[PDB]
């Protein structure tokens, strides 16, 4: 059928109309073949504009619509539904971007901007003539979810989904769920213990009837698409039959070796037979071979007989419909900031080390001590923004929580030792959520905590006494300060967790400039990804505190429940398919697809390629690589792109 | 053009029917065996190097063979006779620039088994005559059909 | 290795002993040293960078063209010239409007900079290209003294273009002077400025001497028998500054000062006479007794 | 009197978003280029580049995700292998390698996209018009 | 007290423009990235014994206090580059101070000893020219009695005077060519 | 009706202020003040814009970068000092803002053609009516009280009643959307 | 039985440890006293009505209704003003991306008005809520626009014939609106 095209140029008030001569573009568009109706309007995405298109589709019997306006990344869904309402197939609509890509970047070259818009319209019409009607592909949804990471965020997502009635798998890398919240003593701004809020959640998640918890396990493979994911979980070997394990801890006492306990950030030392922290869930012990010596000593004192060195990792295969990534974060390693002396000075510590020191269940019994003297420091300095808001370390972002947790641990130190003098060296105090500013006022007024507005230039250790001197300008006085301290705490920032690269490679999701995982839209889809069926929750999506991480966990469960509740979703048909009559089975395409969609088949005696439509994401790499042209990606055919290139220079007549 | 094909085209027009050429690429007619896992090319060989195995696809052995980018119809006598296809029959109806498509395919599968690490400059450096490798019979019909001077 | 030997001003015209030391030491390590005939002030970045940035770069590019027409890279023994010429080369490498501006000026004198000159510091050349083992091989007289190493600021920094490693805790000059048998002693605020740079010695003299006096004090408390530098400006400030410090504040230290070329000279068996130690404003003889 | 005609191919996910970011930031650059959207840089092949030169392109730009950041995992690696052959093929045809420019530009990199467009414009402007279109028209 | 009328809203943009293309627009415009943390001031050795506060210089520029150009404090920076190394906002502080000194110098705020150093380079090609003690010393040491430097090469000294005039540098320091001396 | 060429933004108006009873941070005013400063600069580059602040709170993903961008790319000025008063020139209608530049130790008195008060957030007028109908409590900031800030951030102590958005407390759009979805899951 | 010795004791008597300890003993004893007379009670199971109510049609309430609607739950959305959209509909752009605020929100407003599982009651208010979780009985007053939704275009040719100018609240009172009005064009 011969193309009948409606072309719509948008002024966007004066965003486009101020630079691009839209009436002139409109007139030029009517010179191109098959353009039946062309008009300029001030707001095309406004209801009068949409009603103008749909109404022309019926009155003028159009089979194609071109809209020269903003980016398809904003309104392509808007205008696709607009045309669909008028009976026109949504893939007979083509978007020309004359704002972001023309009027807004050529404001001082209007004549050339108008001429550029004309070429961008002609390139749009050119591809529009050869567009084809497509149909969305419906697929079923497996009624099960997968949560990766068992911090507050992931736990919250599993409990919400499980409470909704959806089967849920929760995979935790370490022997215990709980995450970094488990490492904290108290939590701002209520100053509850972290255990107050987290531990009941850890208990509920372990015995939930709809949640299968795989602790000491990791996802090792994910294949498929929304509603149809096939995942492989490596359930690592603890070397203790958990079913028989009691968690009494008698075995740990006999162990003859010591191991740096990672849960205590390398401060406290554990046995090779261990349980991360006294409230760990599952309350089961684990043997670490990296140091195990196999003298049987542990097994001798165990009644049940749970210890067993013949254990081997088991791989589990599970169907899931949706995945939520909630793998948390790591503390910044402040070694690279040489001026502060972390890793060099004994009494320079990170804040996350301080949490393990101040925590009652901690290696020091909740006692803040200098790691050189063993004595309690009577003067303490907090240094803010360590590894954050710093281009020299490649972290130009704000880590969100370090202002509050520094004031938090200052309140707690003051409670355990009112005589302690505490100075916080800061640039901005960012106490931005409910009760935070009040928490900030309370830290100074009630707890007498001192705030120095001045980012320290260096920390000078006294080699003889282990004492530290902090050089910084009191910017609010215009004077240089050189105060001495018994202990300096570096308020390190948040950075992606070490295994984030592995998880990203498996789920196939993107990252923002700050190296955290990228949400689908920074405003309206904070827990969705651009990969359908994959969602985010917690600090792995960006630096944030516990209330935000919990709300995201519940938000990600609502989003991930929409496909599960619907039981069906639609996938875009901008996919690749083989023309059997052109393909002589050369085999070039097979290895090009990272999802294994193209396959060599034997029908009618001959070999022919064949694309499993469900496995194609629509990249279009292997059609570009097909030497016979049998392979084409709908909506991005070679002939369609050829017309678009010609349209830059001439009408496709 | 083979003699039978000339006969079919003309007799069709004598009868009044439209002639129709074969549409698939050459691997159809060719009797050489491919890998069902797909084409992967580790290194590139000039046709005088090594000893080509008589039954394995020459492209997977590392020889620039134009069968993949060439229309069927001839019977694939060159690969049957022990040499790569030179592409003399030209592209299929769905390819305009035969050499461009052959280059696209060749580059896509070169080092594909080691996709993210194979150095992308090995392939241009191993081919000394590129236009002659990919545009033997079709250069005047390529998008760029001349060398500028 | 053939290198155009940029001389600067202070070493050739005042502390000529450093030039003599350099010419032999680097011939001995196996570097041919070419003359840059007609090379001028680099020009000193402190005064000329402070008066007119365009004049600094244009006159700096002119000295680079001398070496580019020679088909040879520059090495300098002074941080001052190193900073000025290196940063000039890099900005002309990296900023193409700055390169256009300069050659439109140098076009009027029949010159054009094309980006081929690499500028090298002789201490860094020794570390990266020659090897510190090659200095030990030629130690004719080991120098068993404690040395207060002064890196100077314009050697390592800016690190983002120098790419000479850490400026906070470097080892390059310490290993070089330790290859002669001496011990580089740690002292408080080791990497701090001597006080002379940026025109400060000329305009704010007592300010510059306050920083030099701090450095000397910390070296003496760490048991240094002398200080070693890689810059005639540092040399003048530590040497001549001690006279000024004494005349103005009243402290006397008689702390001997050496440029690294002179210290390496002593190790390789050079005559103190050809090092022109007599022209030092502070007597080196207390040092000569210990070695 | 003469302005370069530049054609661009940008991936939907990273580079097309970088060009949007430059427009949101009012980052001005020369109005020579026209950008064609594709889902992935792996969709780009030699024939598309050669087709543009045939049509009259003085310069050709391609932008995709950083290597490893492909929205479709590894589309850019195929594209990178093709473009290295295409650089030297363009020379055998007497077309300056510099007339083709490929860059890796993420959606946040509006500033980088702006200077890439400026550097490429100046490069093509200094080369003068590509004379292919006028030779075929003899 | 500080009023609008005593401020110059465009001072920062002057400093930027003075730095184009040398040492660079992006280098000097980094001045606008400063967020007044004070890391530079804590690192400054000159600040440890004077009223000089590096951060205040940047601040006064951003606010538009022209008296920076007349201040003695911009001249107490030794250009050690330490703040440059540690600034979390990539502020090219050392280059910003030198550019500010250019505008200070073209306003006539140049020390006499600095003008002298500039005159010696214009007249003899060298900030420290050779005297006769230089010759007799270089003799005894075994060096060429005169260094192979521009000082003893009229062609290279012509080249510098040519370039100097083209740059207006001689008029900047107020040097008179026939009197062969500076104008105060 | 003329266009103002000099514009002053005053932060923390109605927030962090015990004199008006609002001792909380309104969370978005730092960012929206830099935002509209960018949008004014885009429509009029020669406009001078000063922001009088106490802490710049650019705390979420892209916020600190947005803050750096406002100063480096858009040339927006930041004065650390809460203004003490605004004085109108009755002749011209212009405004003088008086504040200590705390980072200089000197009192500023700059003149502006328009002063913008970065007002904070308070509960909506009908929050009293809704509160009585649903039977829910309020936090000290006068917004609605969640069951617990970390255990149940969108629940209320009234079973079957949930919260979402700025009615629960000052926050930006992504935060309200997340609570919207969170409250959907919980409900 | 629960004894509160934290919020009610340990956290409010930190400077009087001896009395706080004595107080905790009394609070335990008062709990044990009541505990002795506590009786076994049976939790009351009630059916849950398969419908939700969202009060407020801003970005936060719209998100909750769309999420609930998309899950397959009947949902009522009650908006007090004539139009949904909230203050986001008043913004020009949104930090930190500077997206057009209305241009990204309007597709959500469209979606919620068209959603099969969402009943939108604009210009309406909840005036009474009765019952408990899962068993709420609510009254919604659909206020009178005095215009027939079915018989009216939305063209706005009756404002000209109006002598009363009213503070346009959507524009925060800077511009005047007529007695008959539409809040904003994208309403
Ligand atoms: C010193 C400090 C003090 C703080 N104080 C406070 C405070 O007082 N109040 C407050 O609200 N917030 C505070 N925070 C922030 C708080 O820690 C975070 O908001 C919270 O921990 C985020 O929870 P999460 O589940 O998103 O990530 P995490 O807590 O890090 O949990 C991630 C979980 O995922 C698991 N995981 C990781 N990788 C994998 C993988 N590849 N496969 C499977 N599982 C994996 C981990 O084992 C972990 O259990 C503080 C942070 C720090 C550093
Ligand atoms: C000047 C300013 C600039 C801002 N800029 C930004 C920005 O750039 N980016 C950003 O993310 N955020 C910004 N914010 C914050 C943003 O406005 C809020 O985050 C957002 O509006 C929250 O949406 P909401 O639905 O929770 O509340 P609202 O937007 O206020 O919506 C509440 C809805 O409920 C309706 N309603 C009220 N009472 C009743 C009742 N009794 N019955 C029924 N319905 C009722 C209201 O009419 C309204 O439609 C800004 C805020 C201000 C003040
Ligand atoms: S369409 Fe894109 S551009 Fe035309 S108006 Fe609505 S938004 Fe502004
Ligand atoms: S002993 Fe056997 S059982 Fe008691 S804990 Fe250690 S393991 Fe679990
Ligand atoms: S065996 Fe491995 S684990 Fe059991 S005790 Fe001896 S060591 Fe500790
Ligand atoms: S939070 Fe307080 S501390 Fe952590 S970064 Fe943002 S500001 Fe610096
Ligand atoms: S490549 Fe084009 S042709 Fe060769 S197989 Fe896959 S499809 Fe059939
Ligand atoms: S298109 Fe990208 S994805 Fe769809 S198949 Fe060809 S390759 Fe695999
Ligand atoms: S040989 Fe040439 S033709 Fe026969 S298969 Fe391998 S490629 Fe296709
Ligand atoms: S060459 Fe001509 S003939 Fe020999 S094969 Fe390739 S095509 Fe068939
Ligand atoms: S450091 Fe960089 S930022 Fe902090 S002040 Fe000195 S300059 Fe402004
Ligand atoms: S550089 Fe000039 S300023 Fe930056 S520190 Fe050294 S001296 Fe103080
Ligand atoms: S946000 Fe910026 S402004 Fe709004 S309150 Fe907290 S601080 Fe004062
Ligand atoms: S007038 Fe007001 S009411 Fe009568 S129609 Fe036009 S709009 Fe509907
Ligand atoms: O900066 S100066 O050029 O004055 C001397 C420093 S080495
Ligand atoms: S999607 Fe951008 S390069 Fe593959
Ligand atoms: Fe829009």
PDB file of C-alpha atoms in Angstrom, chain A residues 74-75 78 85 164 190-192 196 415 447 521-524 558-559 561-562 565-566, chain G residues 6-7 11 14 59 63 67 70-71 88 94-97 99 103-105 107-108 114:
ATOM      1  CA  UNK A  74      10.730  10.880  26.247  1.00  0.00           C
ATOM      2  CA  UNK A  75       7.550  10.703  24.137  1.00  0.00           C
ATOM      3  CA  UNK A  78       3.280   8.785  24.264  1.00  0.00           C
ATOM      4  CA  UNK A  85      -5.960   4.815  19.532  1.00  0.00           C
ATOM      5  CA  UNK A 164       1.707 -11.215  48.877  1.00  0.00           C
ATOM      6  CA  UNK A 190      16.052   7.169  66.446  1.00  0.00           C
ATOM      7  CA  UNK A 191      19.242   5.599  67.855  1.00  0.00           C
ATOM      8  CA  UNK A 192      17.649   2.182  68.022  1.00  0.00           C
ATOM      9  CA  UNK A 196      16.103  -3.732  66.968  1.00  0.00           C
ATOM     10  CA  UNK A 415      27.057   8.416  76.141  1.00  0.00           C
ATOM     11  CA  UNK A 447      25.839  16.135  73.482  1.00  0.00           C
ATOM     12  CA  UNK A 521      14.269   6.579  34.966  1.00  0.00           C
ATOM     13  CA  UNK A 522      15.833   8.909  37.567  1.00  0.00           C
ATOM     14  CA  UNK A 523      12.420  10.343  38.544  1.00  0.00           C
ATOM     15  CA  UNK A 524       9.513   7.962  37.854  1.00  0.00           C
ATOM     16  CA  UNK A 558       5.425  -3.929  44.122  1.00  0.00           C
ATOM     17  CA  UNK A 559       7.063  -3.428  40.734  1.00  0.00           C
ATOM     18  CA  UNK A 561       4.845  -8.251  41.521  1.00  0.00           C
ATOM     19  CA  UNK A 562       3.121  -6.538  38.580  1.00  0.00           C
ATOM     20  CA  UNK A 565       0.252 -10.820  39.214  1.00  0.00           C
ATOM     21  CA  UNK A 566      -0.526 -10.235  35.533  1.00  0.00           C
TER      22      UNK A 566
ATOM     23  CA  UNK G   6      13.376   2.181  77.166  1.00  0.00           C
ATOM     24  CA  UNK G   7      11.387   5.062  75.686  1.00  0.00           C
ATOM     25  CA  UNK G  11      16.124   7.025  77.459  1.00  0.00           C
ATOM     26  CA  UNK G  14      19.965   8.782  81.753  1.00  0.00           C
ATOM     27  CA  UNK G  59       2.745  11.759  41.631  1.00  0.00           C
ATOM     28  CA  UNK G  63       2.000   5.814  41.453  1.00  0.00           C
ATOM     29  CA  UNK G  67       0.804  -0.122  40.869  1.00  0.00           C
ATOM     30  CA  UNK G  70      -1.563  -3.082  37.422  1.00  0.00           C
ATOM     31  CA  UNK G  71      -1.550  -5.838  40.066  1.00  0.00           C
ATOM     32  CA  UNK G  88       4.692  18.272  40.108  1.00  0.00           C
ATOM     33  CA  UNK G  94      12.803  18.787  37.715  1.00  0.00           C
ATOM     34  CA  UNK G  95      16.335  18.530  39.084  1.00  0.00           C
ATOM     35  CA  UNK G  96      18.798  17.003  38.514  1.00  0.00           C
ATOM     36  CA  UNK G  97      17.916  16.053  34.924  1.00  0.00           C
ATOM     37  CA  UNK G  99      13.189  17.069  32.568  1.00  0.00           C
ATOM     38  CA  UNK G 103       5.802  16.381  30.025  1.00  0.00           C
ATOM     39  CA  UNK G 104       6.980  13.283  31.947  1.00  0.00           C
ATOM     40  CA  UNK G 105       4.092  13.241  34.458  1.00  0.00           C
ATOM     41  CA  UNK G 107       1.541  10.135  30.561  1.00  0.00           C
ATOM     42  CA  UNK G 108       1.009   8.926  34.136  1.00  0.00           C
ATOM     43  CA  UNK G 114      -7.746   5.354  31.386  1.00  0.00           C
TER      44      UNK G 114
END
